[PDB]
Design a protein around this ligand. Structure first.
Ligand SMILES: Nc1ncnc2c1ncn2[C@@H]1O[C@H](COP(=O)(O)OP(=O)(O)OP(=O)(O)O)[C@@H](O)[C@H]1O
Ligand SMILES: Nc1ncnc2c1ncn2[C@@H]1O[C@H](COP(=O)(O)OP(=O)(O)OP(=O)(O)O)[C@@H](O)[C@H]1O
Ligand SMILES: Nc1ncnc2c1ncn2[C@@H]1O[C@H](COP(=O)(O)OP(=O)(O)OP(=O)(O)O)[C@@H](O)[C@H]1O
Ligand SMILES: Nc1ncnc2c1ncn2[C@@H]1O[C@H](COP(=O)(O)OP(=O)(O)O)[C@@H](O)[C@H]1O
Ligand SMILES: [Mg+2]
Ligand SMILES: [Mg+2]
Ligand SMILES: [Mg+2]
Lengths: 540, 23, 136, 568, 136
């Protein structure tokens, strides 16, 4: 139960607000207890840390413990429970007594929620008795401790709401370790990459922008993934040295080559991690939490008028949050895109999500409607529950006219209950996008300012726009460019939308496979493949 | 050596629920 | 109270009440009695029922074995009086509900808490009492 | 240390398949280890014997031990414990060391699961260390041996699933003795009746046919029961002597008469068992498989079932037929296993014919009353369904009757909960495991086929559907005659009652209600009849034609829409 | 891992992660860790719930008590990846899927297995590899 001087304060970052409170609530009544002794007032403070798992709860309680220097007693909640029913209380009674016997002391009840659960639903006798034993052991701290020295109890849990209210009351100080912001994630990334050799192109601010929803644990894997990539060049050089020493598959020989030398050690040159490996590392690491879409503005053809409206109400107020906030431009809760179906409403919302570097959630219509009284509204609330936790996040409600119809007299009590839930949530860094092809059926309370009060019309292309889209689609999959003009200018594409042009390209691609199959019975996309693709694709 | 009788933990059970329907 | 073997848990309760009778007049404080006096009806087990039945037997000996000259008072505290077994809850002649303090009580509580400290004469406890609505 | 040279191979029969595997897996790497030494191959095979309890596992492991002749170390799991935590490992460490020291040797861990249970639930420290010592002792066999004088450890247990997976992995060779077949049971009966005096009419092949689901232990009770029947004549003579000596019910007197003398023992003449006593013995002996969970055979015969010839033909050709002549039907590609889903309007005889099939097939019968298998604990609800088929296979041929099956396999909608879905899925897999030549005949009955899952009605599952519907006017005559006949008007009057237009929608139950209404109308007439002729108990109540006349008026069909039950 | 005392089992484990750290660099092989590190939702046994806690704490001491360049790597192999605690499998970023051997690999295994046996001359360790495309 001695304090481990292993993890330092430098190794824990992004907790500047948290470290400020812990200084006057943990450090002071553990090292400067004499001031309390002169006043004669024991300082018993149970500090509770809670937040998403992986935010650095366990690490903080160990970095503080190693810096204060007082005796530290790590306690894990599952290990308290023993084979016998009475032995579980024996383990707890041997902790709160030890801390009193070794005052001043620091108690860390890691994963407190594993044993201090709600004794109401914990009808079993042992479950309801651990909570009682825990609460009595804390009172003995307030009673039997000397005036000279204090005992601080630190509890960590990712579900503070599961704690018994008889217990959560005993933890006056509650620190909710939210998720770090772009400024905070930059501090964490710099802290992790503090003992490493780095290049000059590493933009930690750019890394923080394109890692939304990551926690401290996830960012450690990103650093760990980039370090391995940094040693790839150091392994090929190591293999070449083994090959040059010795004049069965290749991987087996590599193991045999390195078994030869062993004690003979050759120098590994000290290279540094670049920024391109960090960008590669982020892609390879999937966060536990959605994901930024892969669609760029290069995938979006024409629609310059729509892009300017979108680049001035959403995309702008993301890249330069200070430039727009200087002139009093609040980030509108969202945009209500409308037009005929298949024209690129979902495509552009994915492009906005990608040039904004934020998270994207898409709803394909009435997916939230439920036959039950509460689960239909809870789906909408859960939609915004994750969107806040992964801010910045873009919520895209496709075909929103089925989810929020006009609250007329002929509405009953099922869609009105959904419109009201959606109205309150829109009032509560979340950018909500709605799409509907019947704006006369959507509630007018939604289209008010502050709610989705901005309407951008995305409509059918005329003739020049389809040329840009068809060229865009063909470019991203690889006919030349002269044949693409003939296909897009054909009178058979009079009503083609963006989706129809995408369907047209797939039909031409399938026509290619038919040509290859007959070639091998007796590949370049030719104009004749487009000829039969125009016949079998309809505007719908 | 004498073997003593020791009490242990209990099993878990299942509970039925009732759910309303707005329809 | 709870022990490991079968009769260890129930014998600890019997020792508590017998000690109080031997030490009469005495005051037993059963802190968090709902932990061990839970409803054996819904909480169906073998040890749990014997713990409840030992307290009922224990709380009857004190009012019958004392020599009419010294009394034994049993004090119990619980946040969940409804979790107590009715055979044990009915054995407490007095139930005292200590709800959340009012404005008049909160002023008195602050003075008792702020009794060994050094304070400035500017402190107005009425302002402190009125700004802590749902405080215990 | 020495083989038990008192039980021979001749005394254990019906294990021909089991004795074939034990020849190349236990005998050979104990007596012909030199060939393995020339071959250069260590024998790490841990032979495990498992099967139904009473199949002759303990006796076989002692008969094999006495025949091989090598040193034998019998080990009983309860006898391992001596009275100290450390002494239990001392006993185990004194076995695997002795066998190695006295190699080649055979170790028999009888009732291994008594000291080799699951370690996950083994809270006690001593219990969890015996398993570790046992499993480590098998590795020492592979190490401390010349690879020639092998030591084989043979374990027998009736609960192979209770073994610790840390131990069952070390037993590569697993021999499933299973239950003996008709050919095997004949061999057992001949072996059992070898030191007894027998008649000439005893057809052991016939005895084996009418004892399905019996094991070697159960067949020993049948022989033992027949011996008592052979001594029944020798007890009545003993009783008669006591009666003639002494001038309370009769059975009580028999105990009192035989309690009197208690010393005047008389010679029992040495008679022999006949074939009639063996048939009596089989009925008196309940096989260990049928002890628990098997319903009593219904009292309904085909004489209780009126009309329903179409349903009768399907049932007498798919269930009753294959049970009586398993060879005649298998020649024409009729496998001795079926799954039938009886369905129709209520009151038409779905349960009646299933009770008649269970009684007219002379086979084992298990009845499940709706959702009888559901349990409030985790897993125990699904284990009951798996255990249900674990005994239906063991007692083949067996008839499983799921009455009102729509409550056991409901449609898997959103409002189903994760407790009955886990049972429907379990029930679906078990019906798949019912082999074509398994012998299990599953019958399902339900009056609302629109609420039963459609996945149960696929082939391999209850893919045979028999519709039991309302009788026709000519059909009700057979049913009304059947009902009146089984309760005692003649039969010519019954045709008039059943053909009356007031019984247009009557089901089978409604016709039974019609007879009860007529019977009550008779008693009301009798009560007034005996008040006018009297103001002596000699009044004769007889159901007359006029009682049927007023019974037809006050009885209405119980089925509202006959066509409501023809949709699925 | 199993000791003659419930607390002694962790002593044996605590004597492993300490020895590797004291003798760093070192390799720890937790063969079939999930056999004693399963999910403890329904495993109320005291020993079962302490191995997972001991395993996770032992990895942190590796990151702390080492001379930076004297790392200790713990390699775990198991045929039941589903029994691992999700609190532990998240801490194992690198997962190596051995998979099933190919035709070339199965020939080597067959020759290796039949190495201490007496064999004839017609044995062509090539036909066996052809007709075992699903064997391990
Ligand atoms: N603010 C931070 N500064 C530096 N490293 C951090 C920070 N937050 C997290 N980490 C790193 O991520 C990991 C967090 O470990 P820790 O066990 O404390 O996570 P946690 O938030 O407690 O979640 P869990 O309850 O799932 O363990 C460590 O490897 C730590 O180095
Ligand atoms: N095939 C058989 N031939 C003759 N007797 C048999 C046969 N099978 C069983 N028996 C008799 O039944 C009894 C079998 O006892 P045994 O302990 O071997 O049963 P088991 O199959 O091992 O079941 P369990 O393991 O539950 O005890 C003996 O009395 C034996 O004579
Ligand atoms: N063919 C028949 N001959 C004689 N009586 C019959 C006949 N069919 C039905 N019955 C009578 O009707 C009763 C109905 O019993 P049974 O449980 O089989 O009804 P059911 O048709 O299965 O309807 P339910 O769905 O209510 O169970 C029988 O017990 C018998 O009294
Ligand atoms: N300007 C464009 N450039 C390239 N592809 C487009 C464009 N507009 C639409 N598409 C194609 O049309 C398809 C449908 O897009 P969209 O209309 O956003 O979704 P939905 O049809 O579901 O409303 C997409 O797969 C996209 O490839
Ligand atoms: Mg942690
Ligand atoms: Mg036996
Ligand atoms: Mg019925």
């Amino acid at each position: 139960r001695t304090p481990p001087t292993k993890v330092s304060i430098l190794d824990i970052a992004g907790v500047d607000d948290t470290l400020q409170r812990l200084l006057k609530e943990v450090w002071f009544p553990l090292r400067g207890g004499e001031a309390c002794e002169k006043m004669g007032y024991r300082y018993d403070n149970g500090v509770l840390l809670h937040g998403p798992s992986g935010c650095g709860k366990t690490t903080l309680a160990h970095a503080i413990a190693g810096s204060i220097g007082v005796a530290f007693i790590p306690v894990s909640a599952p290990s308290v429970i023993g084979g016998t029913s009475g032995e579980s209380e024996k383990n707890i009674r041997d902790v709160f007594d030890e801390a009193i016997r070794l005052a001043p002391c620091l108690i860390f009840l890691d994963q407190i929620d594993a044993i201090a659960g709600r004794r109401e639903s914990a009808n079993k006798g042992m479950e309801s008795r651990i909570v009682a034993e825990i609460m009595n052991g804390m009172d003995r701290i307030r009673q039997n401790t000397p005036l000279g020295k204090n005992v601080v109890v630190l509890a960590a849990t990712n579900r503070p709401e599961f704690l018994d209210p008889a217990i959560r009351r005993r933890f006056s100080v509650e620190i909710d370790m939210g998720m770090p912001s772009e400024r905070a994630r930059e501090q964490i990334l710099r802290s992790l990459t503090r003992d490493l050799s780095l290049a000059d192109d590493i933009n930690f601010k750019e890394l923080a922008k394109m890692t939304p929803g990551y926690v401290g644990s996830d960012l450690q894997y990103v650093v760990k993934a980039a370090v391995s990539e940094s040693f790839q060049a150091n392994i090929d050089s190591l293999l070449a040295q083994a090959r040059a020493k010795h004049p069965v598959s290749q991987p087996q020989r590599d193991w045999l080559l390195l078994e030869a030398h062993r004690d003979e050690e050759v120098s590994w040159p000290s290279t540094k991690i670049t920024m391109e490996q960090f960008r590669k590392a982020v892609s390879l690491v999937q966060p536990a939490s959605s994901t930024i879409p892969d669609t760029t503005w290069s995938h979006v053809g024409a629609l310059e008028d729509v892009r300017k409206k979108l680049e001035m109400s959403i995309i702008g107020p993301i890249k330069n949050p200070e430039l727009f906030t200087r002139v009093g431009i609040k980030p509108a809760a969202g945009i209500l895109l409308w037009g005929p179906p298949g024209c690129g409403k979902t495509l552009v919302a994915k492009a906005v999500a990608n040039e904004s570097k934020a998270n994207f959630i898409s709803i394909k219509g009435p997916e939230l409607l439920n036959k039950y009284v509460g689960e239909s509204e809870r789906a909408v609330r859960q939609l915004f529950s994750r969107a806040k936790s992964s801010a910045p996040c873009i919520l895209f409600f496709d075909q929103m006219d089925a989810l929020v119809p006009r609250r007329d007299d002929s509405l009953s009590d099922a869609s009105a209950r959904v419109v009201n839930t959606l109205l309150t949530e829109l009032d509560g860094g979340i950018y909500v996008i709605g799409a509907t092809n019947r704006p006369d059926m959507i509630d007018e309370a939604i289209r008010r300012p502050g709610r989705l009060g901005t309407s951008i019309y995305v409509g059918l292309p005329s003739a020049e726009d389809r040329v840009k889209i068809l060229k865009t689609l063909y470019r991203n999959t690889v006919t030349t460019d002269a044949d693409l003009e003939k296909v897009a200018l054909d009178l058979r594409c009079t009503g083609f939308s963006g989706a129809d042009l995408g369907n047209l390209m797939q039909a031409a691609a399938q026509a290619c496979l038919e040509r290859v199959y007959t070639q091998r019975q007796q590949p370049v996309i030719t104009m004749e493949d487009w000829e039969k693709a125009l016949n079998e694709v309809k505007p719908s | 050596v004498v073997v003593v009788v020791v009490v242990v933990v209990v099993v878990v059970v299942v509970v039925v629920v009732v759910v309303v329907v707005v329809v």
